[PDB]
Design a protein around this ligand. Structure first.
Ligand code: FES
Ligand SMILES: [Zn+2]
Lengths: 52, 295, 119, 54, 77, 193, 86, 168
């Protein structure tokens, strides 16, 4: 009943959370828009046709 | 003022109970069903008398006469009419509240017709749905074909009147129209063929006496009791008749003469009984035979 | 089982065989399969008319009122079954879908009339 | 008003319990304040996009 | 169904779902119906919620329940 | 083989040709199956007749073409029912084929539905403890106000023409993506003449 | 098998011998006939006035085969098979 | 035959005949009896016949027996509140003991029927599902409703094979 520890599962969890706080994208990158294709270059997703 | 006794009155229950009688051989007739090897016990004379006594207590619970009710009133009630839903559907929906802790006569069952009308389900539809979601052993959703005219006559021909009443009590409700018609028709065939003994020592005898009395057809029954040395029941039948019909020729005549015992039969035979002549002859024969035994 | 987030929902669980559908009303988690595990069964719905030409719908109102008071949601088809019964109001789209049908049928009466009249 | 069925079941409990009244059961919708769908929500409880540039 | 890691199809790359047309009359009438229907149902939900809270408190802290817990403790002594 | 008792099968059991062949015993008494081993198969052959051709050892019903399985021939259907438990024997008991054992169970159940065959009918108890129709469920309910005035339960069931200023908002809100305005719907559902 | 069958079938006590032996009534109880007591045999001699002493627990040797069947534990694919009439 | 003396004790029909269902307070039951002595006769019969019946109805109650520790037999119960119930069982039959503890610490017939009644409401007859839980699996088993296609084929107008063909 003694669970075998998983240390790599906790190490990566801390590293991921840390990098998400140090490499976090800014509002300038996230909410940018190309006004010709009307796509956010960060994700390459088109906006809805009613917002164009 | 003066209310006429009902079918469930203590005075009437005792009278109809005594007429029915108690016969253990017919009350506990061997059933044709799956069997098991019997069990045996070594008993004394007293232990046998107590066991026979406990069978009498259990037979009086199996002879409990069902209550007699009047034909229930149809249900014609509309909860709402939504004319905007008209034409949007071809068939009707039947919603049924299914909650275990609710009596079936307080249970809500509605119907949304194709006209948008939300009405309450009829008696025929209520009893049907209650059998779909709360099935009862012996009852069927679709009305059997045994309760038809031609098929019922067949059962009557085999002296199976108690079987027709047990089928009707398990398929229909006491206040249903079919429960009354089927019972009344069976009662009228017995009187025609003088088969009153079949229902004796059963729970359907009282209900049969209650129908002949209210419709004044106790002539045949009253005769049979006399032909079987059952005067005590014959006199109680006339007493009961007088109670439910106080303003009758026999009732008024009895009061004047204060008739008792066999006299009541004579008073009733001449005044109100249709077969006055036949009763007197039958009563005559009995009284003569009884005199010989007294000697 | 434990689902991330989610909630309880009163929906329809399809049953029956091919070309013979039979839904059974149940209260189940939002992420659970359609015909998978459920908390309680609250009724049944038979779409196909019976011999009498009527659709049967069972509802355990006493329990439907319990789960709605514990945080359970409702599915659109199930909200249209409670409106047809009188337990809930008629769903807005049950009304608008009827109006669309009226105008549609009135639009077909014109063409039918014109053909018989003009020709 | 209560819808057809619920109204009929509340009037039957009254009569069963013995209370005799002819008042209509009605839902108090004064507590329910229906706000428009374009009403500003809370941004301090709203998420953010993850750092996966494509 | 797909996952976050699975890629997208090449037939949906140049796809644009145009929103449906709007009937000004029906759209406004239907926009009020949801407003009332949802207000009538929000009240019903609150009613049923009060009934579940009551029974629970009643069961653990009730008159009849506490009238029987004392009878069972008095009969024990 | 055309049986003369086709229409009146109950007359063959009360004849002398039946008494000289079977006597007082049932028709399945002098029948034995041919199987390997002491324990026989738990199912009998599907049928003894295949395309107007009879098998070597037919069953009690298929060997005599004058025995017709009808719900009216009560005297033949009693040989396949226990006189002590009122239960229909399984096919291996008598040796009849599945086709005829399926026809007997139907005819036996159809005679019990017509009152021709006697069977045990128990004395059941009533469904309900009370028989009082003093409840709204089974009685009339006070018609609601809107029902007496011929009005809908809720006012928003009916179509209400919205103001013009509100439509212009929608038209402005959806410019270039619009549909022809729909007027109030007809009072009743049209029908195809 | 044959010499033992005839041996046990001849040493079986009838209902009449049992009554005479203990001077008590032999009552038959059937489920089909309800609680009706059926007297199958009674003693010819003087009927005893005292009852048999009721035994809390009987010291009778049981058979595991019968007890195992009554408890739904005797599994067998050869028992209760459909056979011909005998 | 079945090994041991009085083999009927090792039967489910005999273990379920016990009428002593303790309450929730009772946690431990300790029996102290003497192997010899006319006075302790009943205590020995109570350990030989009834303890099996008591433990079968109260499986979460600890029962511990001690031999020849005191000059006289007795029973002692330990409740959850910390209260002890001493019961002298000397010069008494096994039935008196079984009837005595049922009155001071056992449940009555009124408290038992209620518990059973609750269970009956767990199996709703209206529900449809597997035979293990529900009586009926589908609604095609109800006369009047549409039968299963496995037994009675549906009309060609009610099958999606032809609905598509008729339409196209
Ligand atoms: S099982 Fe009910 S439809 Fe096949
Ligand atoms: Zn054959």
């Amino acid at each position: 009943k003694k669970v075998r520890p998983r240390l790599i599962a906790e190490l990566a969890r801390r590293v991921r959370a840390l990098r998400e706080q140090l490499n976090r994208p800014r509002d300038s990158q996230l909410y940018a828009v190309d006004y010709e294709t009307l796509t956010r270059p960060f994700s390459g997703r088109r906006l809805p046709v009613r917002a164009w | 003022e003066t209310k006429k006794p009902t079918f469930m009155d203590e005075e009437v229950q005792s009278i109809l109970t005594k007429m029915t009688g108690l016969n253990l051989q017919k009350t506990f007739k061997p059933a044709i069903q799956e069997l098991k090897p019997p069990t045996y016990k070594l008993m004394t004379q007293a232990q046998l008398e107590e066991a026979t006594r406990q069978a009498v207590e259990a037979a009086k619970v199996r002879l409990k006469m069902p209550p007699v009710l009047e034909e229930r009133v149809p249900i014609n009630d509309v909860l709402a009419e939504d004319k905007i839903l008209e034409g949007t559907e071809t068939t009707k929906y039947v919603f049924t509240d299914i909650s275990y802790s609710i009596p079936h006569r307080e249970r809500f069952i509605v119907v949304r017709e194709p006209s948008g009308t939300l009405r309450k389900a009829s008696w025929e539809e209520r009893d049907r749905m209650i059998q779909v979601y709360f099935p009862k052993e012996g009852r069927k959703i679709l009305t059997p074909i045994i309760f038809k005219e031609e098929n019922l006559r067949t059962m009557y021909s085999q002296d199976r009147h108690v079987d027709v009443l047990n089928l009707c009590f398990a398929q229909f409700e006491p206040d249903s129209t079919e429960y009354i018609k089927v019972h009344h028709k069976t009662y009228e065939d017995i009187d025609k063929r003088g088969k009153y003994d079949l229902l004796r020592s059963t729970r359907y005898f009282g209900g049969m006496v209650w129908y002949f009395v209210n419709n004044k057809k106790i002539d045949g029954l009253l005769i049979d009791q006399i032909q079987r040395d059952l005067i005590d029941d014959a006199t109680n039948l006339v007493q009961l008749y007088h109670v439910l019909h106080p303003d009758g020729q026999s009732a008024q005549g009895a009061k004047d003469q204060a008739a008792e015992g066999i006299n009541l039969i004579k008073v009733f035979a001449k005044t109100e009984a249709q077969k006055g002549a036949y009763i007197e002859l039958t009563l005559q024969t009995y009284q003569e035979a009884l005199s010989r035994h007294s000697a | 089982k434990a689902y991330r987030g989610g909630h309880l929902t009163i929906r329809l669980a399809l049953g029956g065989c091919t070309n013979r559908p039979f839904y059974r009303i149940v209260a189940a988690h939002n992420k659970c399969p359609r015909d998978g595990r459920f908390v309680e069964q609250l009724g049944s719905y038979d779409p196909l008319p019976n011999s009498h030409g009527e659709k049967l719908v069972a509802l355990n109102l006493d329990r439907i009122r319990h789960w709605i008071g514990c945080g359970a949601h409702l599915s659109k088809p199930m909200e249209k079954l409670l409106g047809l019964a009188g337990f809930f109001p008629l769903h807005p789209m049950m009304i608008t879908n009827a109006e669309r049908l009226r105008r549609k049928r009135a639009r077909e009466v014109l063409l039918a009339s014109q053909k018989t009249d003009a020709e | 008003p209560y819808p057809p069925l619920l109204r009929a079941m509340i009037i039957a409990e009254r009569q069963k319990n013995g209370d005799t009244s002819t008042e209509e059961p009605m839902l108090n919708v004064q507590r329910i304040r229906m706000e428009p769908w374009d009403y500003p929500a809370k941004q301090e409880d709203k998420g953010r996009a993850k750092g996966t540039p494509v | 169904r797909k996952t976050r890691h699975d890629p997208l199809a090449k037939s949906k790359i140049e796809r644009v779902n145009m929103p449906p047309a709007v009937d000004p009359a029906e759209f406004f009438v239907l926009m009020e119906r949801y407003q009332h229907y949802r207000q009538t149902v929000r009240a019903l939900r609150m009613e049923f919620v009060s009934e579940v809270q009551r029974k629970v408190h009643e069961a653990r802290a009730g008159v009849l329940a506490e009238r029987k817990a004392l009878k069972d403790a008095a009969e024990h002594r | 083989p055309i049986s003369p008792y086709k229409d009146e099968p109950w007359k063959y059991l009360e004849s002398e040709e039946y008494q000289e062949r079977y006597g007082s015993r049932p028709v399945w008494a002098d029948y034995r199956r041919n199987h390997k081993g002491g324990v026989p198969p738990q199912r009998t052959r599907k049928t003894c007749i295949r395309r107007n051709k009879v098998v070597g050892n037919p069953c009690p019903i298929c060997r005599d073409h004058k025995l017709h399985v009808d719900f009216r021939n009560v005297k033949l259907l009693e040989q396949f029912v226990c006189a002590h438990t009122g239960i229909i024997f399984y096919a291996p008991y008598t040796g009849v084929c599945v086709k005829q054992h399926k026809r007997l169970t139907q005819a036996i159940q159809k005679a019990r539905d017509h009152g021709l065959l006697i069977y045990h009918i128990p004395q059941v108890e009533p469904r309900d403890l009370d028989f009082s129709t003093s409840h709204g469920a089974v009685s009339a309910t006070p018609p609601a106000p809107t029902l007496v005035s011929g009005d809908p339960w809720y006012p928003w069931y009916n179509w209400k023409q919205p103001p013009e200023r509100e439509l212009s908002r929608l038209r402005r809100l959806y410019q270039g993506h619009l549909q022809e305005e729909s007027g109030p719907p007809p009072e009743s559902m049209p029908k195809m003449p | 098998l044959t010499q033992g069958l005839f041996r046990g079938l001849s040493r079986q006590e009838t209902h009449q011998q049992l009554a005479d032996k203990k001077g008590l009534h032999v009552v038959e109880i059937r489920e089909e006939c309800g609680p009706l007591p059926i007297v199958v045999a009674s003693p010819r001699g003087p009927l005893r006035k005292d009852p048999e002493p009721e035994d809390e627990v009987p010291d009778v040797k049981l058979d595991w085969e019968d007890v195992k069947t009554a408890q739904g534990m005797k599994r067998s694919v050869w028992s209760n098979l459909k056979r011909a009439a005998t | 035959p079945m090994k041991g003396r009085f083999p009927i004790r090792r039967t489910l029909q005999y273990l379920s005949q016990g009428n002593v269902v303790f309450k929730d307070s009772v946690k431990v039951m300790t029996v102290n009896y003497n192997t010899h002595g006319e006075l302790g006769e009943g205590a020995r019969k109570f350990v030989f016949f009834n303890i099996p019946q008591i433990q079968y109805k109260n499986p979460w109650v600890q029962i511990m027996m001690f031999k020849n520790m005191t000059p006289s037999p007795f029973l002692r119960f330990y409740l959850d509140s910390g209260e002890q119930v001493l019961v002298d069982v000397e010069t008494k039959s096994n039935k008196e003991i079984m009837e005595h503890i049922r009155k001071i610490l056992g449940k009555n017939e009124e408290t038992l029927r209620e518990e059973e009644e609750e269970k009956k409401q767990l199996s709703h007859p209206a529900n449809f599902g597997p035979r293990k839980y529900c009586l009926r699996e589908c609604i095609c088993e109800v006369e009047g409703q549409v039968p299963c296609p496995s037994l009675v084929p549906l009309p060609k107008e009610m099958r999606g094979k032809y609905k598509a063909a008729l339409k196209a």
